[PDB]
């Protein structure tokens, strides 16, 4: 739809479809929506993030949300999330970047204190510790890329 891609292209987009267009679009139009849309509801954003459809829309929606939105509000909405897909997401993360790590830190702060199990946390800590090792190695590499006594001599020349 050229008309709908144009009304995406347009900056201002008042109330109605910007309220509920994800129920209408949920491929290519959705990609144009995720790269550009003025107003998007955080619930819809986070539900897409933890939707396991996973066309690197993870990376894209994570970028969109941590660009436009504020961390305290992100905290309360990830608190209003449901824990089972949170396990799904953290399990997927330790399976297998800036926006992604920002999101992992945020959901850790959102869950807080209580409900984290032994296998999950040991797996997470091994993952992040191996990545800290290789990350610091790469940073030191980055710095690297940023960087009289002939008292007696016996020789000969060619004459």
């Amino acid at each position: 739809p050229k008309t709908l891609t144009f009304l995406l292209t347009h900056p201002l987009f008042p109330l109605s479809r910007t309220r509920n267009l994800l129920s209408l679009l949920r491929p290519r139009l959705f990609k144009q929506a995720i790269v550009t849309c003025p107003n998007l509801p955080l619930n819809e954003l986070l539900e897409e993030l933890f939707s396991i459809r996973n066309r690197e829309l993870l990376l894209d929606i994570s970028f969109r949300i941590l660009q436009d939105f504020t961390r305290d509000s992100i905290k309360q909405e990830m608190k209003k999330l449901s824990k089972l897909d949170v396990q799904n997401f953290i399990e997927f993360i330790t399976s297998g970047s800036t926006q992604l790590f920002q999101l992992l830190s945020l959901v850790l702060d959102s869950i807080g204190l209580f409900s984290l199990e032994g296998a999950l946390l040991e797996n997470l800590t091994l993952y992040i510790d191996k990545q800290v090792e290789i990350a610091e190695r790469n940073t030191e590499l980055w710095n690297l890329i940023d960087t009289a006594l002939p008292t007696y001599t016996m020789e000969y020349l060619d004459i």
Partner: protein, 50 residues
Amino acid sequence: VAVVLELYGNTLESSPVLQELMIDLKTKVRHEIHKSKEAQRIEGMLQLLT
């Protein structure tokens, strides 16, 4: 320390007195970076209490 290490590497490999000081300086910065690396963990930990 960065700019003197930039300049005088020839005299470094020539002279033994400084080779003493550079190895200890290798410890202290590595000692200091471990201190400031632990600093961030305790700062982010306090973010979890908010």
